[PDB]
Design an enzyme around this catalytic site. Structure first.
Site, PDB file in Angstrom:
ATOM      1  N   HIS A  93     -14.396  -3.541   2.170  1.00  0.00           N
ATOM      2  CA  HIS A  93     -14.652  -4.879   1.708  1.00  0.00           C
ATOM      3  C   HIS A  93     -15.770  -5.454   2.612  1.00  0.00           C
ATOM      4  CE1 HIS A  93     -11.528  -5.487  -1.123  1.00  0.00           C
ATOM      5  NE2 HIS A  93     -10.537  -5.288  -0.265  1.00  0.00           N
ATOM      6  N   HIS A 121      -1.646   1.223  -3.395  1.00  0.00           N
ATOM      7  CA  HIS A 121      -1.615   0.565  -4.699  1.00  0.00           C
ATOM      8  C   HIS A 121      -2.771   1.024  -5.569  1.00  0.00           C
ATOM      9  CE1 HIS A 121      -4.627  -2.465  -4.110  1.00  0.00           C
ATOM     10  NE2 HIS A 121      -4.012  -2.956  -3.036  1.00  0.00           N
ATOM     11  N   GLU A 131      -5.463   3.169  -3.505  1.00  0.00           N
ATOM     12  CA  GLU A 131      -6.116   2.804  -2.276  1.00  0.00           C
ATOM     13  C   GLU A 131      -5.080   2.653  -1.177  1.00  0.00           C
ATOM     14  OE1 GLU A 131      -7.258  -1.297  -1.338  1.00  0.00           O
ATOM     15  OE2 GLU A 131      -7.600  -1.494  -3.512  1.00  0.00           O
ATOM     16  N   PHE A 152     -15.957  -4.284  -3.257  1.00  0.00           N
ATOM     17  CA  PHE A 152     -16.161  -3.256  -2.256  1.00  0.00           C
ATOM     18  C   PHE A 152     -17.566  -2.716  -2.266  1.00  0.00           C
ATOM     19  CE2 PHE A 152     -11.655  -2.796  -3.314  1.00  0.00           C
ATOM     20  CZ  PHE A 152     -11.038  -2.566  -2.084  1.00  0.00           C
ATOM     21  N   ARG A 189     -10.747   1.300   3.287  1.00  0.00           N
ATOM     22  CA  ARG A 189      -9.776   2.015   2.451  1.00  0.00           C
ATOM     23  C   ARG A 189     -10.188   3.414   2.093  1.00  0.00           C
ATOM     24  NH1 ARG A 189      -7.940  -2.295   3.882  1.00  0.00           N
ATOM     25  NH2 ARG A 189      -7.696  -4.142   2.616  1.00  0.00           N
ATOM     26  N   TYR A 224       0.848  -1.182   0.000  1.00  0.00           N
ATOM     27  CA  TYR A 224       0.000   0.000   0.000  1.00  0.00           C
ATOM     28  C   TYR A 224       0.895   1.247   0.000  1.00  0.00           C
ATOM     29  CZ  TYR A 224      -3.807  -3.220   1.197  1.00  0.00           C
ATOM     30  OH  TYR A 224      -4.742  -4.235   1.135  1.00  0.00           O
TER      31      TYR A 224
HETATM   32  N1  LIG Z   1      -7.132  -7.485   4.202  1.00  0.00           N
HETATM   33  C1  LIG Z   1      -8.121  -7.765   3.344  1.00  0.00           C
HETATM   34  N2  LIG Z   1      -7.845  -7.917   2.054  1.00  0.00           N
HETATM   35  C2  LIG Z   1      -8.957  -8.201   1.317  1.00  0.00           C
HETATM   36  C3  LIG Z   1     -10.259  -8.356   1.752  1.00  0.00           C
HETATM   37  N3  LIG Z   1     -11.112  -8.664   0.674  1.00  0.00           N
HETATM   38  C4  LIG Z   1     -10.322  -8.697  -0.376  1.00  0.00           C
HETATM   39  N4  LIG Z   1      -9.005  -8.413  -0.055  1.00  0.00           N
HETATM   40  C5  LIG Z   1      -7.865  -8.399  -0.957  1.00  0.00           C
HETATM   41  O1  LIG Z   1      -7.092  -9.535  -0.653  1.00  0.00           O
HETATM   42  C6  LIG Z   1      -5.675  -9.221  -0.698  1.00  0.00           C
HETATM   43  C7  LIG Z   1      -5.064  -9.362   0.703  1.00  0.00           C
HETATM   44  O2  LIG Z   1      -4.863 -10.755   1.104  1.00  0.00           O
HETATM   45  C8  LIG Z   1      -5.610  -7.823  -1.303  1.00  0.00           C
HETATM   46  O3  LIG Z   1      -5.514  -7.936  -2.730  1.00  0.00           O
HETATM   47  C9  LIG Z   1      -6.933  -7.200  -0.823  1.00  0.00           C
HETATM   48  O4  LIG Z   1      -7.404  -6.213  -1.703  1.00  0.00           O
HETATM   49  P1  LIG Z   1      -7.144  -4.685  -1.423  1.00  0.00           P
HETATM   50  O5  LIG Z   1      -5.654  -4.502  -1.264  1.00  0.00           O
HETATM   51  O6  LIG Z   1      -7.721  -3.974  -2.609  1.00  0.00           O
HETATM   52  O7  LIG Z   1      -7.892  -4.427  -0.154  1.00  0.00           O
HETATM   53  C10 LIG Z   1     -10.534  -8.184   3.144  1.00  0.00           C
HETATM   54  O8  LIG Z   1     -11.624  -8.261   3.730  1.00  0.00           O
HETATM   55  N5  LIG Z   1      -9.380  -7.885   3.882  1.00  0.00           N
END
Ligand SMILES: Nc1nc2c(ncn2[C@@H]2O[C@H](CO)[C@@H](O)[C@H]2OP(=O)(O)O)c(=O)[nH]1
Ligand SMILES: [Ca+2]
Length: 104
Positions: free
Chosen positions: A92, A40, A58, A100, A77, A38
């Site tokens: 998420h 990213h 984000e 999202f 985020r 991050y």
């Molecule tokens: N930490 C986290 N990552 C999520 C979740 N749902 C999807 N991800 C995605 O899973 C990966 C992390 O293991 C990242 O690509 C993250 O996307 P973002 O970075 O866009 O949040 C969530 O609830 N928590």
């Protein structure tokens, strides 16, 4: 009251500002933190109504109020653009997969 509510997380405008500032700085510096690197790139495939132009990035916003420093990023985020303009606050939480929902 909450300026933004992500699932059960409550954020004030100051929380968003502090987070955005940190993420933007890393961006200018060509630096990232955390296993998922991050800040990213963020792609608006769900078509949220952002009033600012892409590209978008984000950066995690922590319920605790602490600035993300590597470590579990949680589900919330802050989304900012190339010009350090706030696009929105998303989560998420309550979305399936990698998707999202906007924070209310
Ligand atoms: N930490 C986290 N990552 C999520 C979740 N749902 C999807 N991800 C995605 O899973 C990966 C992390 O293991 C990242 O690509 C993250 O996307 P973002 O970075 O866009 O949040 C969530 O609830 N928590
Ligand atoms: Ca707070």
């Amino acid at each position: 009251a909450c300026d933004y509510t992500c699932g059960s997380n409550c954020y004030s405008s100051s929380d968003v500002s502090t987070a955005q500032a940190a993420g933007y700085k890393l961006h200018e510096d060509g630096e990232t933190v955390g296993s998922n690197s991050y800040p990213h790139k963020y792609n608006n495939y769900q078509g949220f109504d952002f009033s600012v132009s892409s590209p978008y990035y984000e950066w995690p916003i922590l319920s605790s109020g602490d600035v993300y420093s590597g470590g579990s990023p949680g589900a919330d985020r802050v989304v900012f653009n190339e010009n350090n303009q706030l696009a929105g606050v998303i989560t998420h939480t309550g979305a399936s997969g990698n998707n999202f929902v906007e924070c209310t």
